Amino acid sequence: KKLIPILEKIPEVELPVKEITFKEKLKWTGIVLVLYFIMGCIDVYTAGAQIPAIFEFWQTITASRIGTLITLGIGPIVTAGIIMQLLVGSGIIQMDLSIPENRALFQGCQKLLSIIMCFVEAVLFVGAGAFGILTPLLAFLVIIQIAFGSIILIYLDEIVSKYGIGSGIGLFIAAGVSQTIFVGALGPEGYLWKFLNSLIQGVPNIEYIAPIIGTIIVFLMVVYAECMRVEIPLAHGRIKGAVGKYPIKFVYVSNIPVILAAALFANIQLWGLALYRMGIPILGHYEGGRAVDGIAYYLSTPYGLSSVISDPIHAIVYMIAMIITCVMFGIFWVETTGLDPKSMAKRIGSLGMAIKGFRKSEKAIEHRLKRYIPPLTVMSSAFVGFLATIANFIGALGGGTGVLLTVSIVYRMYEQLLREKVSELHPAIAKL
Amino acid sequence: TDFNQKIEQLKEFIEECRRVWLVLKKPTKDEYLAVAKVTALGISLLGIIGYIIHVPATYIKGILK
Amino acid sequence: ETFSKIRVKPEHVIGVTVAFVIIEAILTYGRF
């Protein structure tokens, strides 16, 4: 038995088995993209035109933009997914998805929670003093809009997910970061100018061009890392001699994973401040907006403009803190979904392409996989998480880490555009 | 006792990781630049579009605030 | 697949979104 009643009440998206042309998947995606950017232009209906700065920490991983119709962004969806991976991860609620049951259970369920976390975050946001005027009346109104905007995304994700290319989330995030860059550097109060102008003014300010560099450096770094692969020689498909040489995206393995680690921290700095100016200092003493002490403090990413040396210890902890959090969701990405050997089985078996090493059988390869995975999975994340973190010390526009995900998401998005440009020819090989 | 075991094991797994972090393919300049290119090219489109929409839509919010 | 007893065609969510925009886009701005 399960929460199937209300679960069946939660709408979904009509997936046509008709012809969805590449041109259409593309054009679709684009419409989503814009409604997004657009929503990021519209402020939330609120007389208190005065808002307490911003939370320079949540926006990036959340793909949000505080003060707008998407002030909560992907934040909920991520939160939700975080819990699931937590439960269905630490065995607390052991589930063998295999059957379309558990699979659609884990999912449907999470989806719901996403709407739950949709409002929770909303309230938590205003309750964290994200706007300043807690007019119980006005406050209520705001929350409404807020979480409802995030809802639209949840459904816009669904759309892209079944009518276009790539992924909503993935997109969305890349959508935000990219913009955050092109605008921050070149827009109105753009940095490139503030620097360029500062040159003309005759008082060359290295602080105006700085952040822009930070971003190049990161991008360059993050990309290098995104190139590394673990090549797995494959066994001749009945033929003989050296053949395959299958590579694996050693970084993009722990993608969704790190998205969750960073997002965890996102819900801590939010949940701490929230449960600060609305209770007891359980997590930490914020003051000044963000946190200046407590779990919160030790778990607040240092980036923004320039790296902070004036707190070595702070660095160390964070790093290690992130690192481990990454390992975690990685492992929890194992027990669940992730690359599941059961399947990859016959997939390499149909082609009869066992690993280069040896063993051309089902149970054979199946095994060699179940085994090699976990270390891969853990190594990857541990690394990424490191990179991501260090990518923040260095600090960059859009978000060291954000840039990362983006760069990846963007490339996994290029691939998507190709696997499509081709599938648009031989109407069949939709699995090779 | 078990504690000793687990300790013995993590040392093992961790070493299994070292193995993964070894079967790694450094990129080949040309290959590298490929990614870098496409990548940026993408962040560029996406970024731009958000600009085309944002910037101006703020020139408004601002000249009517 | 999904146990969503209800089916929603994307054209709607899109239009429903064009809704949120128009409403607040005017509900807020264009004061008076």
From Swiss-Prot, chain A:
Extracellular topological domain: 46-54, 129-139, 191-208, 277-311, 397
Gene3D superfamilies linked to this entry: SecY subunit domain
One Pfam family linked to the record: SecY
Transmembrane segments: 28-45, 55-87, 110-128, 140-160, 168-190, 209-226, 255-276, 312-330, 382-396, 398-411
Intramembrane region spans per record: 55-62, 63-68, 69-87
Location(s) in or outside the cell: Cell membrane
Record's GO cellular component terms: plasma membrane
One Gene Ontology MF term: protein transmembrane transporter activity
Membrane topology, record value: Multi-pass membrane protein
Cytoplasmic face of the membrane: 1-27, 88-109, 161-167, 227-254, 331-381, 412-432
GO biological process: SRP-dependent cotranslational protein targeting to membrane, translocation
UniProt cross-references to InterPro entries, sorted A to Z: SecY, SecY/SEC61-alpha, SecY_CS, SecY_dom_sf, Translocon_Sec61/SecY_plug_dom
Subunit description: Component of the Sec protein translocase complex. Heterotrimer consisting of alpha (SecY), beta (SecG) and gamma (SecE) subunits. The heterotrimers can form oligomers, although 1 heterotrimer is thought to be able to translocate proteins. Interacts with the ribosome. May interact with SecDF, and other proteins may be involved.
Family: Belongs to the SecY/SEC61-alpha family.
Protein name as it appears in the record: Protein translocase subunit SecY
Source organism of the structure: Methanocaldococcus jannaschii (strain ATCC 43067 / DSM 2661 / JAL-1 / JCM 10045 / NBRC 100440) (Methanococcus jannaschii)
The encoding gene: secY
UniProtKB/Swiss-Prot annotation, chain B:
Keywords on record: Cell membrane, Membrane, Protein transport, Translocation, Transmembrane, Transmembrane helix, Transport
Entry-linked InterPro entries: Prot_translocase_SecE_dom_sf, Translocase_Sec61-g, Translocase_SecE/Sec61-g
Membrane-related topology note: Single-pass membrane protein
Cell location: Cell membrane
GO MF, one annotated term: protein transmembrane transporter activity
Disulfide bonds: none
Cytoplasmic-side positions: 1-34
A GO cellular-component term linked to this record: plasma membrane
Coiled-coil regions, chain positions: none
GO BP annotations listed: intracellular protein transmembrane transport; protein secretion; protein targeting
Parts of the chain that traverse the membrane: 35-60
Top-level taxon in the UniProt lineage: Archaea
Pfam families: SecE
Major place of residence: membrane
Oligomer status and interactors: Component of the Sec protein translocase complex. Heterotrimer consisting of alpha (SecY), beta (SecG) and gamma (SecE) subunits. The heterotrimers can form oligomers, although 1 heterotrimer is thought to be able to translocate proteins. Interacts with the ribosome. May interact with SecDF, and other proteins may be involved.
Protein task: Essential subunit of the protein translocation channel SecYEG. Clamps together the 2 halves of SecY. May contact the channel plug during translocation.
Family of the protein in this entry: Belongs to the SecE/SEC61-gamma family.
HAMAP family: SecE (MF_00422)
Protein name: Protein translocase subunit SecE
Protein's organism: Methanocaldococcus jannaschii (strain ATCC 43067 / DSM 2661 / JAL-1 / JCM 10045 / NBRC 100440)
